[PDB]
Write a protein that binds this ligand. Structure first.
Ligand SMILES: NC(=O)C1=CN([C@@H]2O[C@H](COP(=O)(O)OP(=O)(O)OC[C@H]3O[C@@H](n4cnc5c(N)ncnc54)[C@H](OP(=O)(O)O)[C@@H]3O)[C@@H](O)[C@H]2O)C=CC1
Ligand SMILES: NC(=O)C1=CN([C@@H]2O[C@H](COP(=O)(O)OP(=O)(O)OC[C@H]3O[C@@H](n4cnc5c(N)ncnc54)[C@H](OP(=O)(O)O)[C@@H]3O)[C@@H](O)[C@H]2O)C=CC1
Ligand SMILES: O=c1ccn([C@H]2C[C@H](O)[C@@H](COP(=O)(O)O)O2)c(=O)[nH]1
Ligand SMILES: O=c1ccn([C@H]2C[C@H](O)[C@@H](COP(=O)(O)O)O2)c(=O)[nH]1
Ligand SMILES: CC1(C)N=C(N)N=C(N)N1c1ccc(Cl)cc1
Ligand SMILES: CC1(C)N=C(N)N=C(N)N1c1ccc(Cl)cc1
Lengths: 546, 544
């Protein structure tokens, strides 16, 4: 039992890193990895001006102490040293870091401040702080103090040396998802030395998304708890596919303690379907694992929910969206933009098997577009006018949001029962419902059929984008985008690729920027959309057929 | 010097009692309703597999790493010594008598008989016995067991309860009536309270649940990480100051709330605590949230709220009315189902700008869309036979001929006809799922009045799910309820508060006349609710 020093004295490291401004000239396809976030400082200060949320997080971690837990800690440290006034944490920093703290904040409040330095000695300081000219001295000092936990708070030189010596039990690492000029960086973490064990929710602060992750040092009333064991007596049956699906293939996924990154709502569903889904076979013979009824919520005010565990592009879906909004049903419009989302559903073969023998190739019929702007009108062909015919649902919801915010009747429905058979294929996205409160807009979209491996990722982006669009032209701030899944399935084809995916740890979501000028839902164009700071894993082919 | 030191618990199971004076239908319910213990030496009900599995699992469960605190507390308070640990099972001679030779003594349990004339000389060397109750305390203070369970019988429970010798009461509730001669003592809610309520199940043609009575007292690594991650969350709740949590004494006092009704209850609570203040189309007030989802296992129970009284004749007729495709308000009014009365009046119709609609002619609503979606609506008396898309007929054929179709939807939100309706439908659609001979249904509701509507809405679609499943030779599975704009009218706040503190009873069951195989052939007499035990009716608008 070779007791590790970082465990005895509970020495942790907490930092924050942004993306480095390194030259990515040559390939528009930038590769990403955890080492993407490593910019620590610039010209003696932080690359970014400031970050309120990160600061709030920092303050909360380094000042929180658990009185009751100290009792044990003391025993631990004493026996390690063979030994038998409000509790505070210790914060240790390089001299350069200390000299960057504004005088009105020196020393860090409610914390025992320790400073590393050779050029300066205690006489050179006016504040209540401890000065040490060597690492070993820290261990000595900790042995003589009464503290909860000890946090190494920078800078690069200090993080560097504490990591080599393996004196860090954990690393509270903040990932600022934006680029800035840097001259100082955090050391490249060794994945065989440190593994991520927790990922936080994603937030926005000072014009940038960010999350919090925790790296751990890689290995190598009490009675009411029994009423629980009793209450779980009938949980006799477990995962029907656990055999066909070996949890051992989700090593990383199951090794994570806290999985709060919103992307996990998508990822956990994939897991649930794989571990408990029912085996079924759809129309062509392809098999699937299925479950019924799920709900996912994304905070569009905090980030754009574009999956990061694989690569996605949105040009196509944005064009589809603009295509929907124009009321179009002409598949060629999309194909002339090299968007093939609908190409397969408009062929001669496809149309004929739908019994649409009298439908021109690529004329998709009364689908989404047609329903949003002309529900109820008799469809003729994709070239017809239809001006002022049928119900313009889109304009209606826009007016309801503007003039009757609290209405509980703001829905956009595509499932026109009468037109179903005339459609190339019935709509998957049945309807959208909006909610308005305190100047914010939320949207609920009900999806009847859901291809988790290929479809859902794009669907989430589509409606999140749509919500931003409606909210803007109605002079509102987008809030939540609720996604309700009906028949949720995973095609057998996608399993091996999804297993890979579930083992990738999410990156902080990127953000969506809309041209602020656009004021009418119809005046948007492809160039009015900007997806910024999209950090993602390499793309995957859900289908590995060759 | 209490009854908590030795950890003496009591575990039982009581059914409902019969009465050749009253019959089968009951009127006023309370915890004492469940008290049937035994009949003619045996249990009132033949055998209940799930309860037996429950019992055998509790009185056999052991936690060696937890015996620490007891050896300490037990010997340390007797001021004496201790004199693969198992549990103890104390019973009456008769209780032990009824047990069959095969399963006697009770496997893996320290059997003990509190008999008077029992010749210990004729029992095992491990089958302890005692002459007086007081004698139990001794044997225990001399043994090294994990826990002591009083498993009966009737007389044995009484004596122990009176002596305040019970720490907790594991009470199984069989929501079914039987002939009885012995009963459990009326529990005094002043000296005993309920802490946890389990999920409801169906076993041996009867629903049942497990509740726990607790005698009123009157690593750390990731643990901290949990705190850092909640560093930005809100200290208090939006309307916490408005609606005081202390008013939910019972609701909070509960540790485990696995009864399905909590899915509904927890939402009432969530909207009350975190709901946004908002004014609606009425001028009245509401607290509202957006997007919830409830799931009910229709194979284990009928989710008819028990924390208040609900009637269903009306909603069933409405359902039959939809199936017929009617839009005629009078039909319902002549049966005294006034669910749509306010929506069919001259004024209401005129406010909807429907100046040319006959009174009670609700227009192309639910029923019309279900059987004639697309047909031109004329008046409520017209013949629409074979006009418009008959969705109802279509989904049933889809279920029967192509169960794995993901296009099985019944949609009532016909955009083209919205303004012609007295009012837009709240229940936008139903989607069906079929697996291994089981039918599941999701119903999306755009507007949810949690205090008055939602409760009935849950009953309707559950009933509908059974109906559909039966005419398709399928068994019902889950009823999934998706709420969009979920709200609580301010006027209901006081009643819901009262409702939130009531503990749900084990749900009742729904029985349909099995002969009915066509969705169009149901009639009111084909529906029967069984064993509906509920708390008294509550005026949602307590405001008088
Ligand atoms: N992104 C983040 O999370 C953080 C960023 N920063 C940023 O990083 C920069 C500062 O980092 P950096 O330049 O590496 O400087 P440091 O803050 O790490 O300080 C290095 C100095 O501290 C003293 N020191 C360090 N180790 C020892 C030792 N073992 N023994 C004796 N003295 C020691 C010495 O100072 P002396 O010269 O007196 O001998 C040394 O020159 C700034 O730009 C700041 O904004 C700082 C903290 C966190
Ligand atoms: N629902 C449930 O959880 C349970 C239901 N039951 C049912 O209830 C019935 C049996 O219960 P019950 O009638 O009370 O019979 P009991 O099992 O409780 O046994 C009563 C007898 O045990 C002895 N005894 C009990 N208390 C004392 C005491 N304080 N001091 C000395 N001797 C004592 C005496 O036997 P002796 O004749 O030797 O003097 C007494 O006549 C059956 O119909 C059975 O099916 C039984 C257990 C549990
Ligand atoms: O936006 C979309 C459109 C389609 N699909 C998937 C779901 C099904 O796998 C297939 C359509 O088949 P049906 O549901 O119609 O049977 O396409 C999605 O996931 N998202
Ligand atoms: O089956 C029903 C029918 C109606 N309502 C409620 C929802 C709203 O409170 C009101 C309808 O008004 P609007 O939401 O359409 O405005 O009735 C229900 O909860 N369930
Ligand atoms: C607040 C900040 C930037 N944020 C994080 N996550 N970690 C640190 N060590 N920080 C830090 C704290 C104190 C000083 Cl003086 C410098 C940087
Ligand atoms: C198994 C059963 C019916 N079930 C419960 N919940 N409680 C008891 N005390 N039981 C019982 C245990 C032993 C004997 Cl002999 C009779 C009934």
């Amino acid at each position: 039992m070779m007791e590790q020093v970082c465990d005895v004295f509970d020495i942790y490291a907490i930092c924050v890193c942004c993306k480095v401004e390194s030259k990515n000239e040559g390939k528009k396809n930038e590769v990403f990895n955890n080492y993407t976030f490593r910019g620590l400082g610039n010209k003696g200060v932080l690359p970014w001006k400031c970050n309120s949320l990160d600061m709030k997080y920092f303050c909360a971690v380094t000042t929180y102490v658990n009185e009751s837990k100290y009792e044990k800690l003391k025993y631990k440290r004493c026996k390690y040293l063979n030994k038998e006034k409000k509790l505070q944490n210790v914060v240790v920093m390089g001299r350069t870091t200390w000299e960057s703290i504004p005088k009105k904040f020196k020393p860090l409040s409610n914390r025992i401040n320790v400073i590393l330095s050779r050029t300066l000695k205690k006489e050179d300081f006016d504040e209540d702080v401890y000065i040490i000219n060597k690492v070993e001295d820290l261990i000595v000092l900790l042995g003589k103090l009464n503290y909860y936990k000890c946090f190494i708070i920078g800078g690069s030189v200090v993080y560097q040396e504490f990591l080599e010596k393996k004196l860090i039990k954990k690393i509270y690492f903040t990932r600022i998802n934006s680029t800035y000029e840097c001259d100082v960086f955090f050391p490249e973490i060794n994945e065989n030395e440190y593994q991520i064990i927790s990922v936080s929710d994603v937030y926005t602060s000072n014009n940038t998304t960010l999350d919090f992750i925790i790296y751990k040092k890689t290995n190598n009333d009490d009675e009411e708890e029994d009423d629980f064991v009793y209450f779980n007596f009938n949980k006799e049956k477990e995962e029907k596919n656990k055999n066909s699906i070996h949890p051992n293939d989700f090593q990383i996924y199951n090794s994570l303690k806290y999985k709060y990154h919103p992307e996990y709502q998508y990822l956990n569903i994939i897991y649930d379907i794989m571990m408990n889904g029912n085996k079924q076979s759809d129309r062509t013979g392809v098999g699937v694992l299925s479950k019924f009824g799920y709900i996912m919520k994304f905070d569009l005010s905090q980030y754009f929910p574009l999956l990061t565990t694989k690569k996605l592009f949105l040009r196509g879906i944005i064009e589809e969206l603009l295509w929907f909004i124009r009321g179009e049903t002409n598949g060629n419009t999309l194909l002339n933009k090299n968007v093939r989302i609908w190409e397969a559903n408009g062929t001669r073969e496809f149309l004929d098997n739908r019994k649409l023998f009298h439908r021109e190739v690529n004329d998709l019929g009364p689908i989404y577009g047609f329903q949003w702007r002309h529900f109820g009108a008799e469809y003729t062909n994709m070239y017809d006018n239809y001006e002022n015919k049928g119900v313009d649902q889109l304009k209606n919801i826009i007016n309801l949001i503007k003039n009757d915010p609290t209405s509980r009747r703001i829905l956009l429905c595509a499932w026109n029962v009468k037109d179903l058979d005339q459609m190339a294929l019935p709509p998957c996205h049945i309807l959208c419902q909006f909610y308005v409160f305190d100047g914010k807009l939320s949207c609920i979209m009900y999806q009847r059929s859901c291809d988790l491996g290929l479809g859902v990722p794009f669907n989430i982006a589509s409606y999140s984008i749509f919500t931003h669009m409606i909210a803007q032209v109605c002079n509102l701030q987008p809030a939540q985008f609720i996604h309700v899944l009906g028949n949720a399935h995973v095609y057998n084809n996608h399993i091996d690729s999804l297993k890979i995916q579930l083992n990738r740890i999410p990156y902080p979501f990127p953000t969506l920027k809309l041209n602020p000028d656009i004021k009418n839902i119809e005046d948007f164009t492809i160039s009015d959309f900007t997806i910024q700071n999209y950090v993602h894993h390499e793309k995957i082919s859900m289908d590995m057929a060759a």
